[PDB]
Amino acid sequence: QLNHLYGLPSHAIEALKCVFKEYSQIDNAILYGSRAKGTYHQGSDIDLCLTGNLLGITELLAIENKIDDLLLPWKVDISLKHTIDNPDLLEHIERAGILFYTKE
């Protein structure tokens, strides 16, 4: 109930940022979907898109396994940017996507 952004508590956002910090191949991560539009309900998914060039499906599935181990209640749909060929999905990410994490 006590949220920070996107209807999520601060510690959840930071825990995900933590898992992304383990991967130097992640240039950034963009939040899209309902939590980026404000049209989210309590148990809504967390839709994230990892922008990175050195990221393969191997790292993709490893990150998903790490996220799962965080034991968060929300589901996380993670996807690599350069692996998407759905024009509609791309349009939505570039129009309504919020910068969720940045590598520094």
């Binding site: 309900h41 309590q42 148990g43 799962d68 034991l71 209640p73």
Partner: protein
Amino acid sequence: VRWQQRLNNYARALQQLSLAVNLAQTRPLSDLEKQGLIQAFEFTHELAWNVMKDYFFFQGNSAITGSRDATRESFNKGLIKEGEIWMEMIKSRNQTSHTYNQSVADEIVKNIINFYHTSFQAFLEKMQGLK
């Protein structure tokens, strides 16, 4: 049908757990009674997440395997409202073997009395309304 029998067994288990919790909210429990409360929470939560799994299979979702998947899907589909509490329930389950250290047992008992019982009752009311 299957998830409705699991829900009846869950209701019985939650009756027992509610007796235990209500005893805890009126007077401090001994170590043995704390361990018994932990055991009651354990079998109640087992029944609960199996109820979620059965219900979602009945809905056409056969991808759920364990308590994690069941809990997350229940949170996403509105069966439960406080997901973090159910994830902590799972974490408590994972600590069952270390309840002989009184610190772990006390923490789990606090969680059972202050949070898990309300969530179990809410889940029982929700599922019963979907029969």
